[PDB]
Amino acid sequence: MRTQWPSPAKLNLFLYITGQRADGYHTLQTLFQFLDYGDTISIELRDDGDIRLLTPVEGVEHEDNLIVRAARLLMKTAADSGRLPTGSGANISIDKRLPMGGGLGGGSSNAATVLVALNHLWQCGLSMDELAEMGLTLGADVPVFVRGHAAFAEGVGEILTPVDPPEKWYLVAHPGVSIPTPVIFKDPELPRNTPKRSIETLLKCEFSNDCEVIARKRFREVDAVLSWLLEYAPSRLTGTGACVFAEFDTESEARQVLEQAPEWLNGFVAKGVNLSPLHRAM
Amino acid sequence: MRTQWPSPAKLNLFLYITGQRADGYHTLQTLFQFLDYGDTISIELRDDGDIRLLTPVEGVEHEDNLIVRAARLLMKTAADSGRLPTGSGANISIDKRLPMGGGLGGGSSNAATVLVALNHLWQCGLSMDELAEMGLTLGADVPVFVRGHAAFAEGVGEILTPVDPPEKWYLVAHPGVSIPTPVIFKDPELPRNTPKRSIETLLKCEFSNDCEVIARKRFREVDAVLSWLLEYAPSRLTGTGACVFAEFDTESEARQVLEQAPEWLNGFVAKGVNLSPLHRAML
Ligand SMILES: Nc1ncnc2c1ncn2[C@@H]1O[C@H](COP(=O)(O)OP(=O)(O)O)[C@@H](O)[C@H]1O
Ligand SMILES: Nc1ncnc2c1ncn2[C@@H]1O[C@H](COP(=O)(O)OP(=O)(O)O)[C@@H](O)[C@H]1O
């Protein structure tokens, strides 16, 4: 039989870069909230051990797809501890709505959703801790999606504390430019020394994204989108860009501004949700 | 009173790059063993809450030193979970023998030793898991040093399985070139698709380091050292370089080859040990 599984977007409501190790990896303090909007993943079980992604994702080959990578990692990890019933396989299809990149975390969401879904359908019986561990090897943000709650992330992205930030409505704009994450993280002007602070401190401070000053400066398209939206509401970069979000108390106000937006904002409106649509449909 | 604390070197006996995430981070499968050789960190407790590093490290600012970063992170973490006695502080001095970088893990080791030593001396009682967690925020290799045993490391460097590889003797050479880790990791020709395999598979395969082919080609001083050493013994890059190690069954044979070595090898000899000298001193 066929099952459907949400793969929501996220926003980083705040993102602080606390340090960079000698190998180049940046430590962060960041707050994740889900959008009630995203991809939908359909799965049909197989009993011949095969994994198939039936829907190509534009510009990614089958075996590099995070969906396939996640399913094969789960398969291999389970099998190595005798947790994988013989024949365990799946046909996987994605209704893909989230942009590629943008800082909405679509790739990580897809991998989280696949691990959680297949763990359940194959009855591998892995813990959420185990799924989150494994997921972190595939994408920086997979653990927040696997665990399913709005969360303050630190450590190397593995330390997650649930929080319940305001479930606002957002106008999420996608400036017409591609920003690969390394492009921002290699920038010499990137802040990399924001003081580590408590969740109690951060939650009461003004929210900002340390990547924003850089993305705005290097990419005119982000500067244009941000300038346009700040005339209406507090608006920030999510992830390492390019996407930018404007916060509103109600759907009507968000959509009021959307209807005034130029086409080049490539905007949509969605509500922040603290429990993931994945886990909710569970 | 003054206590002394080993901060040993490591070698990666093998290092496989299994993948790279969208954010640029590379996942690895690698085997660590310690050297019975390294830095020594001396600590004197303070009761006024200060942290001082009395010995500056070449080219590294006080507050950018991983010794200071690690001491301050523990203090904050203990204080906020109510596990730091009032006034806990320390004077810290390092007898620094390890090169800067080189793939011997000196910075990570210094940070691990500080965490372990100050956790013990201030009586905070943080677990090894907590100390390894904290440590991984400071350096990629801190967890192996905190947990104190030769180990197979995977995950994002947090998943450590004890292993007992052969305690060989090594001639460790330092080609005369600086290799920042990011330069190797950003290279387009670096392997990033080595199949993730089981520890049993790995332990019974030929050992290699996926970074070596890049380091050799970009920095021919590394190519020189490797070529010279490979005439005498199996030899490989450690970490992302520049250091290269050659393995030997005995100290005599290793020092015999050292004796013949040209000056530009900048070599020393040390024995691999599976229990960290830090943890051995604490027995
Ligand atoms: N199913 C997938 N969805 C999105 N990106 C994918 C997928 N599979 C592989 N990728 C690759 O990995 C990157 C992930 O980017 P993104 O969609 O923002 O996800 P995330 O930010 O969660 O990693 C993309 O650049 C893309 O080339
Ligand atoms: N006490 C320290 N010893 C060595 N390196 C340090 C120290 N403090 C900071 N560093 C930084 O770490 C890098 C060198 O790394 P290395 O000495 O091999 O240890 P590791 O690679 O394990 O951090 C340099 O960029 C240096 O500036």
Question: How many separate domains of chain A?
Answer: 2
Bound molecules: adenosine-5'-diphosphate
CATH topology of the largest domain in chain A: Ribosomal Protein S5, domain 2
* Termini Cα gap of chain A: 17 Å
Largest interface: A-B, 32 and 33 residues
Helix-strand sequence of chain A: EEEHEHHHEEEHHHHEEHEH
Overall SS class of chain A: alpha+beta
**Total number of β-strand segments of chain A?**
10
Number of helical elements of chain A: 10
Largest sheet of chain A: 10 strands, mixed
Helix content of chain A: 25-40%
Radius of gyration of chain A from CA coordinates: 19 Å
Morphology of chain A: globular
- Fraction of residues in β-strands of chain A: 25-35%
For the record, the CATH class of the largest domain in chain A is Alpha Beta
Multimerization state: homodimer
User: Which second-level CATH architecture of the largest domain in chain A applies?
Assistant: 2-Layer Sandwich
Function (chain B): Catalyzes the phosphorylation of the position 2 hydroxy group of 4-diphosphocytidyl-2C-methyl-D-erythritol.
Enzyme class (chain B): transferase
Pathway (chain B): Isoprenoid biosynthesis; isopentenyl diphosphate biosynthesis via DXP pathway; isopentenyl diphosphate from 1-deoxy-D-xylulose 5-phosphate: step 3/6
EC number (chain B): 2.7.1.148
Would you mind describing this structure in some detail?
The PDB classes it as transferase. Keywords: non-mevalonate pathway, isoprenoid biosynthesis, kinase, transferase. It forms a dimeric assembly. Two copies of one chain form a homodimer. With 282 residues, the first copy, chain A, is of the alpha+beta class. The first copy, chain A, has two domains: 1-164, Ribosomal Protein S5, domain 2; 165-282, GHMP kinase, C-terminal domain (Alpha-Beta Plaits). Chain A has ten helices and ten strands. Chain A has helices at 66-79, 106-121, 128-136, 142-147, 181-185, 199-204, 212-218, 220-230, 251-260, 277-280; strands at residues 2-20, 26-46, 51-53, 89-95, 151-154, 159-162, 169-173, 235-237, 244-248, 268-273. In chain A, strands 1, 2, 3, 4, 5, 6, 7, 8, 9 and 10 form a ten-stranded mixed sheet that branches. In chain A, a hairpin with a 6-residue loop joins strand 8 and strand 9 (244-248). In chain A, helix 1 (66-79) runs parallel beside helix 2, helix 2 (106-121) runs antiparallel to helix 3 (128-136) and helix 7 (212-218) packs across helix 8 (220-230). Chain A starts with a strand and ends with a helix. The relative contact order of chain A is 0.20. The site of one adenosine-5'-diphosphate (ADP) has 16 residues of chain A, from helix 1 and helix 2. Residues 57, 60, 64-67, 100-102, 105-108, 110, 139, 141 of chain A line the site of one adenosine-5'-diphosphate.
